[PDB]
PDB file of C-alpha atoms and ligand atoms in Angstrom:
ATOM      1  CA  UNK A   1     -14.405 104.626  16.826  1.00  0.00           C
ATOM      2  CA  UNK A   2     -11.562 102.464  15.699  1.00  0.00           C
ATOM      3  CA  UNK A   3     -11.239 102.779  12.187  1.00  0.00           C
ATOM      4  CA  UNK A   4      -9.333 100.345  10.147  1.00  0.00           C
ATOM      5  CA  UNK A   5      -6.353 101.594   7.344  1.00  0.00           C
ATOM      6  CA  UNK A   6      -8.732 101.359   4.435  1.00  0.00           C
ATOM      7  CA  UNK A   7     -11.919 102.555   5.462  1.00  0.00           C
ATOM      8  CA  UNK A   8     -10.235 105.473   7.045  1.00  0.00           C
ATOM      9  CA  UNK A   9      -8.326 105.859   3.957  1.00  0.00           C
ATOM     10  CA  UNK A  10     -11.557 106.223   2.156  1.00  0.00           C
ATOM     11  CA  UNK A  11     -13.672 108.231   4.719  1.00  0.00           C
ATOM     12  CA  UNK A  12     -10.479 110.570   4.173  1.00  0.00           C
ATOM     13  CA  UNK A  13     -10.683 110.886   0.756  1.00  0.00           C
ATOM     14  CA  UNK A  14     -14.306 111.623   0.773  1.00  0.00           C
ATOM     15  CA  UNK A  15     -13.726 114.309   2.939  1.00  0.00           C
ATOM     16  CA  UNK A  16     -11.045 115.562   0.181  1.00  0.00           C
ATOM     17  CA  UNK A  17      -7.618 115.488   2.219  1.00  0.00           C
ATOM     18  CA  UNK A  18      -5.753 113.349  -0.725  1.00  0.00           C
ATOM     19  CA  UNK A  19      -3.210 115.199  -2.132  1.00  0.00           C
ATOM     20  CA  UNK A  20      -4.783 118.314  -0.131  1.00  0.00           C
ATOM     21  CA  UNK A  21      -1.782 120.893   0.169  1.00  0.00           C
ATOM     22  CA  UNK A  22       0.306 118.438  -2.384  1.00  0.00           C
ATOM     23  CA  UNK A  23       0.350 115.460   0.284  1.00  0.00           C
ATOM     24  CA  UNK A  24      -0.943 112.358  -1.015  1.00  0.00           C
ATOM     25  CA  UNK A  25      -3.346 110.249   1.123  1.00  0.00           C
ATOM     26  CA  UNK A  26      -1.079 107.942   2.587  1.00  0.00           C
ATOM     27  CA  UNK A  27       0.752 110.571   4.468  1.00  0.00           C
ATOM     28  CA  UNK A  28      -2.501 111.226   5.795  1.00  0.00           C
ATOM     29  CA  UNK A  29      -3.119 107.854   6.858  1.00  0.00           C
ATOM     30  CA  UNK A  30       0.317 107.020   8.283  1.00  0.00           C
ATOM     31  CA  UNK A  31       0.066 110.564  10.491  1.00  0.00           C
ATOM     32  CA  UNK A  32      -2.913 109.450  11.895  1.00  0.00           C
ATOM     33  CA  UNK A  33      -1.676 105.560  12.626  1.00  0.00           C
ATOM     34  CA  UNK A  34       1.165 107.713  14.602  1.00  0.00           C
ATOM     35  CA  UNK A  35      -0.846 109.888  16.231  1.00  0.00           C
ATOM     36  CA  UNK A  36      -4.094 107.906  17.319  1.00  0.00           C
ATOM     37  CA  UNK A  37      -3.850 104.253  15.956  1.00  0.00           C
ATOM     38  CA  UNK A  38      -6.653 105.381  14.446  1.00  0.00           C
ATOM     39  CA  UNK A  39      -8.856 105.941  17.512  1.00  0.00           C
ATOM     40  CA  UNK A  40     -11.311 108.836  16.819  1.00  0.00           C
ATOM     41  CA  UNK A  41     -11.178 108.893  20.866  1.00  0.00           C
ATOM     42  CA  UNK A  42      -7.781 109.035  21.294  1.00  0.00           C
ATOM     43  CA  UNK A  43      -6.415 112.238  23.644  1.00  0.00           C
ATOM     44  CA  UNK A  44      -2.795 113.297  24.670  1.00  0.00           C
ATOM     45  CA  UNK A  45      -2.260 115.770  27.568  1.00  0.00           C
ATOM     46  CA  UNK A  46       0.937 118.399  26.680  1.00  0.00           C
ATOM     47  CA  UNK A  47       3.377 119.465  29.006  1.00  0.00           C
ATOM     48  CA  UNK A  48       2.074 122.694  28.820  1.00  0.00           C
ATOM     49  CA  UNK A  49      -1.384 121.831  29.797  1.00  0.00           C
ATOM     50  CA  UNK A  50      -2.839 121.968  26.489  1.00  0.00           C
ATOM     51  CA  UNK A  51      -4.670 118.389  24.857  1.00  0.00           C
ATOM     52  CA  UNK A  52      -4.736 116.561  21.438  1.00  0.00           C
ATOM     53  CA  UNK A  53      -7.516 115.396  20.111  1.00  0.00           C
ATOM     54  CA  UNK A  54      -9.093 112.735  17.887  1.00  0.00           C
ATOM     55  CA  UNK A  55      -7.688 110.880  14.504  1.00  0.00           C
ATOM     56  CA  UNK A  56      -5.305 113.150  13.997  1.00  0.00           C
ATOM     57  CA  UNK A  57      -4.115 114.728  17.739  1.00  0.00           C
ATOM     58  CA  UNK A  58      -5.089 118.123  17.021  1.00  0.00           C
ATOM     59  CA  UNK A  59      -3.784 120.656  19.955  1.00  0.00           C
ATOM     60  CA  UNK A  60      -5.856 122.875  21.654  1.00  0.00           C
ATOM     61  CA  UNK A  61      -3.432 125.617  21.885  1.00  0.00           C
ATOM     62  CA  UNK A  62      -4.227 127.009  18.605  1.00  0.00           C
ATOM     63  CA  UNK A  63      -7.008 124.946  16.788  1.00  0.00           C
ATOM     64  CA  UNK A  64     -10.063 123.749  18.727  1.00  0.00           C
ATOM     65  CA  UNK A  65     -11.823 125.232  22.368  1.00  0.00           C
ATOM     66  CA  UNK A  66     -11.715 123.068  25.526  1.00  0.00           C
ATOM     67  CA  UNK A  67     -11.899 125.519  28.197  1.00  0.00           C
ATOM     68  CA  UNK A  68      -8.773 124.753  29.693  1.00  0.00           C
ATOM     69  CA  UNK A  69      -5.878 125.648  27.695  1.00  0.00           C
ATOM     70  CA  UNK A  70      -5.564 129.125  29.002  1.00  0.00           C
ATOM     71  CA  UNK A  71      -4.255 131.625  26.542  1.00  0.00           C
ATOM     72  CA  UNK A  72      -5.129 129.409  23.570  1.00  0.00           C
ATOM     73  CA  UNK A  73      -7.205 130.121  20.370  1.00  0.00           C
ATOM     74  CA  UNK A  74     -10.010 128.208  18.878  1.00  0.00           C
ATOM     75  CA  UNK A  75      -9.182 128.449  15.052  1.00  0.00           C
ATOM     76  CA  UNK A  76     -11.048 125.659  13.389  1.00  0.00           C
ATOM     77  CA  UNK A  77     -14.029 127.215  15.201  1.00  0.00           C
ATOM     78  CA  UNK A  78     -15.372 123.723  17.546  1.00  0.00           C
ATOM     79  CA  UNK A  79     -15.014 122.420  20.440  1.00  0.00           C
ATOM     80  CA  UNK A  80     -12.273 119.508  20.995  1.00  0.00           C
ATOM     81  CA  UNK A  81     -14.849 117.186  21.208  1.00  0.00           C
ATOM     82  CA  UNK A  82     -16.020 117.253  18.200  1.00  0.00           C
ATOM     83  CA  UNK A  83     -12.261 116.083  16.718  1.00  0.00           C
ATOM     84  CA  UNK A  84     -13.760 112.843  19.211  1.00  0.00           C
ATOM     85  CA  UNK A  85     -16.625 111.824  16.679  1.00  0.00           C
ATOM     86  CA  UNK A  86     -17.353 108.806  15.035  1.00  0.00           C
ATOM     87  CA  UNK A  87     -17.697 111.188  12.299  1.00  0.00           C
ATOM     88  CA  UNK A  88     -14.213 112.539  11.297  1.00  0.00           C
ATOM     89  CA  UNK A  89     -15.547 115.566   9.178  1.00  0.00           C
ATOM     90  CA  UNK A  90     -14.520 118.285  12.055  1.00  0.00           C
ATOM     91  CA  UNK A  91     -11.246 116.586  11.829  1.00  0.00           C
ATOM     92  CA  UNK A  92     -10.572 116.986   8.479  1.00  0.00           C
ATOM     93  CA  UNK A  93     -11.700 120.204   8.356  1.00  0.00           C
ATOM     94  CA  UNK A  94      -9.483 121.340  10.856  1.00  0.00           C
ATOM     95  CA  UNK A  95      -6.760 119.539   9.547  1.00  0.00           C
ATOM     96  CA  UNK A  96      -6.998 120.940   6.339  1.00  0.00           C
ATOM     97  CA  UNK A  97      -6.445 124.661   8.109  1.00  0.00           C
ATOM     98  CA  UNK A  98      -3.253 123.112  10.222  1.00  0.00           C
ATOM     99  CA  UNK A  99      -1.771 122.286   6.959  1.00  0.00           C
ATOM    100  CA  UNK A 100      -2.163 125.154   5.250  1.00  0.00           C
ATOM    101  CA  UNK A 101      -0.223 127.291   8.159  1.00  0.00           C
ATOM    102  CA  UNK A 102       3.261 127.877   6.696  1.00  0.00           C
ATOM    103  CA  UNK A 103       4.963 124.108   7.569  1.00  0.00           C
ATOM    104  CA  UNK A 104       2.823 121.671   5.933  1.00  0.00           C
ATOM    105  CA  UNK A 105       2.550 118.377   7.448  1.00  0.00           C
ATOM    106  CA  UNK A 106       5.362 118.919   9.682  1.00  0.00           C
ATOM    107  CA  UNK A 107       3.072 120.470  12.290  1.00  0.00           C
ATOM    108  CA  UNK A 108       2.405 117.077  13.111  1.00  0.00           C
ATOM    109  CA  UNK A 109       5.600 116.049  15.219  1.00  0.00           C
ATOM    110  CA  UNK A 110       4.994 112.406  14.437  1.00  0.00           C
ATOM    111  CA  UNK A 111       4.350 112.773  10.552  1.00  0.00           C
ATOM    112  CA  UNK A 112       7.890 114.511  10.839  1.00  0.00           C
ATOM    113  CA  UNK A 113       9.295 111.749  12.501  1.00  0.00           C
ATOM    114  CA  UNK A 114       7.939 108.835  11.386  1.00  0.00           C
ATOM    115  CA  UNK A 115       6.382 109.415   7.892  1.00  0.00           C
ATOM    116  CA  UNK A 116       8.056 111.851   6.476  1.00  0.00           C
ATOM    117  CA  UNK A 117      10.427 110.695   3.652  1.00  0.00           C
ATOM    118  CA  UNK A 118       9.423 107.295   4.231  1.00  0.00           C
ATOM    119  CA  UNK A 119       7.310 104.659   2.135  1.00  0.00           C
ATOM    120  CA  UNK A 120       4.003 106.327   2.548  1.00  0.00           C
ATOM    121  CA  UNK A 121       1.883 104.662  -0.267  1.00  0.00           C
ATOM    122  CA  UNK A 122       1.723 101.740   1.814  1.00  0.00           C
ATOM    123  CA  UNK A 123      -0.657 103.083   4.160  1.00  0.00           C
ATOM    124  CA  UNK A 124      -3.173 102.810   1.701  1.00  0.00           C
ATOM    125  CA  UNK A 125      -1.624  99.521  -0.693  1.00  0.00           C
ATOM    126  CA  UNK A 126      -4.499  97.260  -1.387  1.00  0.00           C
ATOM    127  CA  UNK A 127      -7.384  99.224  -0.729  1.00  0.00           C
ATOM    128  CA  UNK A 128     -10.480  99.916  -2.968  1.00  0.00           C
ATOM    129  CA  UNK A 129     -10.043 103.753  -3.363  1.00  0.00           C
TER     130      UNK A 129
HETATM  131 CL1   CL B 201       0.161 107.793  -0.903  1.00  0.00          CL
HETATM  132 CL1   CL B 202      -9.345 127.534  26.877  1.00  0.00          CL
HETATM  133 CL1   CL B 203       4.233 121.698   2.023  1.00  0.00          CL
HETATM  134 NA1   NA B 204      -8.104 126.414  22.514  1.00  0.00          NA
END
């Protein structure tokens, strides 16, 4: 699924990621612009053989089981697909444990290097929340 800014603004804050960890929902929304362009389906294949997944390009190193990341852990407890869903609520939930593992949002590369410090309240200006 494609989502667009707003309604994946508010399928987010449903699933109670605003201001989860102290970062407000448009940080949120502009990491997952970055990462996915908001394509549940999107996946990224690492150097190192390990694959993001979903919304939010969650890596299968650490977070989510794909049988073929050898060495890697399965933290949030699903398989990758599931971070594939039309439904984002494996996403979330495994977001919610990335962000809470000592560095925040920075764990996500591209909310480091394109969010971060920036104008982030824009992400969600003008929608119904
Ligand atoms: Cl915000
Ligand atoms: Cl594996
Ligand atoms: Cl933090
Ligand atoms: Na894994």
């Amino acid at each position: 699924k494609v989502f667009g800014r707003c309604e994946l603004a508010a399928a987010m804050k449903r699933h109670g990621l605003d201001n989860y960890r102290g970062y407000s929902l448009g940080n949120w929304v502009c990491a997952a612009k970055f990462e996915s362009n908001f394509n549940t389906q999107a996946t990224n294949r690492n150097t190192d053989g390990s694959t993001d997944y979903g919304i939010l390009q969650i890596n299968s190193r650490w977070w989510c089981n794909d049988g073929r990341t050898p060495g890697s852990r399965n933290l949030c407890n699903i398989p990758c697909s599931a971070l594939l869903s039309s439904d984002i609520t494996a996403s979330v939930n495994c977001a919610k444990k990335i962000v809470s593992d000592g560095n925040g949002m920075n764990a996500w590369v591209a909310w480091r290097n394109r969010c971060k410090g920036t104008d982030v309240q824009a992400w969600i200006r003008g929608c119904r929340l």
